[PDB]
Symmetry: D2
Subunit: 328 residues, 4 copies
């Protein structure tokens, strides 16, 4: 037993649309326990010595900020910062935790500000975040009144980062991160909203990815798809021979207009391209909480409009779509 | 969805030894829901009409009796009696519920009085009742201070009877009836005590039945085995060509002395034959709550020492045994 | 039992690289037998009436032509023509059988002439033809000295057409048609050459299709990939919203240059674009042996450079590639 | 690959009643290959240097005797005897192989003479020998005109002994030994006759064993059941606490009369008890080809009517029964 999912099993037991998940999830999490991870024991030892207990003040509306009305013990703060730095690299955020600023590789707040204006309100929505990272966006979703956020990300580190923030939130049961890939879910059709941001290009079968997302939505449910694109029309689709911006094992980089046709082909409606953004080195860079290489190292050193391999430089698109039917 | 097992899923989620059961149980219960039963909708409509409150007084020590301090509405009592009579036939009890006497085919209290003197105290024990009927003996086990009783019986009706009594008990979560056969359980090794009373003769493989029971016990756990026997030494074993006392699909009726050797062969220790009882027509008979044929109709009408088919008449034996190891 | 695969089971039993196929194939063919097809009984009755002997003369080098030295009974020839016409529609050929000319929708000989100059000699090669139709090209592969041809096509009719020709060939055991999709094959790595001609656009996951092909090749084995393309560079990929040339359930129409990158990404080497051909209405048309609609009906009736839907008109490309390693 | 079952797969491919076995057998034999056996490599090296080629003379009617019209090379005979002695212990026989007398622990010929008078003639019958040992009785079955004998025995040594005799028979394809237990067969209903001799007492579930035998028979098919019994009526059934005659992991020793009721309960007809034999120390003993302990060591040294443990001494019964239906 690396990590006990008792609390999640309890939650989906008591939910008429997620209870069917109990037919496959428990054996998958049993298997995940037995594939020992080198670092997980160390990570857990550090997670366990993070302070337990509810903070006085939580902002998950405008940021992800935790504080106490009481200034914290100087020495307990120094320990906490050291524990959180154990979970390097911190890629998604930022977080402000009792005045500790976790300056993540990504300004994940900026992507959130690009998405929020275009989505159906999250008030009392159940949400699936596919490839949620450490779950930054799930906190922002609860900030907007979401009833339940389930994240899936196969990274052991991001489950520990998520549980660190969730413990510092006082053990909030309205968000959960499951160490799965999207390919491991059955057809649940349980969620009002599904996010898939930064996942499509990692999937060998892009149309199967779009069908797997459609299969998690209630009828009239909403998809937010975010992915790396190129410029062009409905037949502009980059598939790199080698790496794209130093990423291994990436596949399809369609144009936003191609992706819209793809979403229509698999049976989404009201498909809208709502945002295209050329990723600046201020949205993604090396920081003191993520000391590895980042976007500046992945660009042509003489031409920021190209990756080091010669392809057009990272461009992220947001599409919003509806699964057919009325939303009940 | 005939019946939602949400509350049982929640319980085993939070239990270190039963959580592994989530790896097979939910699909089995999903399959059970989809094998529609003719009567279950009617039964459920009646179960849902039974009053929802906690009663003021419960005796599960000396009987199974429920009452209120303030006498019930005269008309609400007549309705309750009608709802409970919906669940005909009532084979196992008796029960007294707000002065309504459920006069069951069996005096299940009499078997309980024969068993109780020979068992390890149930205080704080987790118990499995294999072939529990409507759960009569599970209430008596909670009466003796059992922490947890899980019953398994594949009868749809007995699940409805159990849930009727459990609702009238105020929704007591310390007992549960799962609509399974013992062959559907994985090796849990989770229970301090296991009861198998009246099951062994129904099982084609008696030694597999005994191993299945052993597989639900913690180290040093206690088995209570009760079954129909014949008289004789370690090599006396009736297997009827015909029916036995009108029962179809029955197999092994060993002597109590043979059954002791059987338990020893499969690896039980301290095996004790503690009681043999020739079933009288006062223990099992037709009543107003079970109007079908019963033991008097199954006996030779000229010789009550024989079944209608000519075999020795029903004789029940109780054996108690320990699974190897020290009991922690 | 629609059709007994006894002879194929016998063949792979005695073959060191294909025997492992017996671990999944027989259940798949058992399942296929039990999904009754409306027409198969009629087809079989006609197949069984086709003469059983070996013919005196076979040309599978320059065409697929069968004849006898002594002219056939005038009346037996009229019966044979009637039996073969039972298997309408005849899409792939042509065939000449005892002077009966099967004028197929497709001039499959023309594709064969475009392919043959670019392939490694087939002498003593084992070959997989993926989506083989009635097996026309497998006869041409045996013509070129292939040791073994295994075809897979999920069409019931094309299995009957193949078995009709194979019976008229004298029951030649060097070619076989299995009623499977490529997704049903395990990783065999058993074949010197693999053909996939006209399949890729039908597959939702094009890169999975290419890996499935790679998984049937011995080390250093050769792939012949033929498919519908569009014009353009490495980022030209049509995915139609609509039908393409009246076809339902089609997906990816990359450029030949894009397809070369795709084959390189999934790990093929020495990838060569060897031919592009704009399909003329002389290559594919309605005939007396295939009386349904064909390419002329699928083209814009005012502009043969476009499909009826407005996309560029059918253009077929041939690519040849090697699986990594030396070919033993 | 310990042993290649190519020839068996070929045979059941071409048999309409055994072909369905290909749905499960190949994965089971693949798994059996990968459970490496310490001795199998050595055994195989010795099997491979046994002379290949047909003998001139075979008696499988009155014994199992192989000879050449030509007396054999003195030195080749010395090598052969040494190779065959590699496969110690030789429990079932005897065999006479080019004048080499393999004096087996058991006089298996004597059991054959007790069985033969009572069975339906084997001429053109397909036969299953369940727990066939090295396949001695399958040779005697072919001697009586059996068309096909399939043996199953999970002992790696007995498969090597069988292949040694089968190679010395010239590679006779009418008999085969599969390294399986009876529990691994699906319901084939393929065999005219089934033998189960010396197996029932090794099976934890005796009634499941009798059903598994019934499941291998064509309708109107014949069972020969042979097993260790006690004396007594329909309720005489020994189940030993410990060992019986030094055997570990044995279960039910019913009387012949009990076993007859058991066969009727599971649905056999025309059940006849045809022979009971108290095993003499001349039927089973230590020999120069089986140097381990044997029946004399397993008996009370002062009372040959008892096993060393005190139970009645070995008594073997033969029952013959019919599966319901007419035999087509
Ligand atoms: N098969 C799979 N299913 C789900 N998530 C996956 C996945 N393979 C990779 N991922 C995750 O997808 C994430 C892509 S990075 C994007 C993170 C976050 N959604 C954001 O928009 O900022 C990584 O955290 C990676 O672990
Ligand atoms: N495979 C199986 N597993 C568990 N219970 C079974 C079973 N087959 C039958 N039963 C149940 O076993 C019970 C036998 S009657 C005995 C009931 C109760 N234990 C008592 O002692 O009075 C019935 O309720 C029947 O439904
Ligand atoms: N999943 C799949 N696997 C294999 N073949 C398939 C398939 N789906 C369709 N096919 C077959 O692929 C063929 C495409 S038509 C091309 C036929 C032939 N290879 C030629 O070049 O002329 C059809 O016969 C169709 O039945
Ligand atoms: N589960 C199983 N299925 C089939 N055979 C089994 C078995 N378990 C044991 N056996 C085999 O049963 C045999 C019993 S000894 C009897 C051998 C022969 N039938 C005879 O009558 O002389 C042994 O060879 C043993 O390996």
């Amino acid at each position: 037993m690396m990590f006990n999912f008792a609390n999640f099993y309890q939650l989906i037991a008591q939910d008429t649309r997620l209870q069917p998940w109990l037919n496959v999830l428990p054996q998958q999490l049993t298997d995940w326990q037995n594939a020992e991870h080198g670092d997980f024991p160390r990570w857990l030892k550090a997670l366990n010595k993070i302070p337990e207990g509810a903070p006085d003040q939580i902002d998950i509306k405008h940021s992800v900020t935790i504080s106490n009305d009481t200034p914290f013990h100087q020495g307990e703060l120094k320990k906490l910062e050291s524990l959180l730095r154990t979970f390097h690299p911190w890629r998604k955020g930022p977080y402000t935790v009792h005045g500790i600023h976790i300056d993540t590789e990504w300004r994940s707040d900026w992507k959130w500000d690009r998405v929020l204006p275009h989505i159906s309100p999250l008030k009392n929505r159940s949400v699936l975040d596919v490839g949620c990272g450490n779950g930054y966006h799930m906190w922002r979703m609860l900030g907007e009144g979401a009833r339940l956020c389930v994240g899936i990300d196969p990274s052991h580190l991001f489950l520990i980062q998520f549980e660190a923030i969730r413990k510092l939130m006082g053990g909030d049961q309205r968000a959960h991160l499951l160490p799965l890939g999207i390919e491991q879910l059955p057809k649940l059709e349980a969620f009002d909203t599904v996010f898939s941001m930064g996942v499509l290009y990692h999937r060998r079968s892009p149309l199967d990815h779009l069908i797997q997302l459609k299969d998690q939505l209630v009828s009239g449910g909403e998809l937010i798809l975010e992915t790396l694109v190129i410029e062009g029309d409905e037949t502009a689709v980059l598939v790199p021979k080698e790496r794209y911006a130093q990423m291994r094992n990436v596949y399809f980089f369609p144009s936003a207009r191609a992706l819209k046709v793809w979403l229509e082909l698999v049976g989404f409606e009201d498909v809208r391209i709502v945002d295209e953004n050329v990723t600046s080195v201020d949205e993604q860079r090396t920081t003191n909480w993520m000391t590895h290489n980042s976007l500046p190292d992945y660009l042509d050193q003489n031409d920021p409009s190209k990756t080091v391999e010669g392809y057009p430089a990272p461009r992220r698109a947001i599409l919003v779509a509806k699964k057919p039917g009325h939303h009940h």
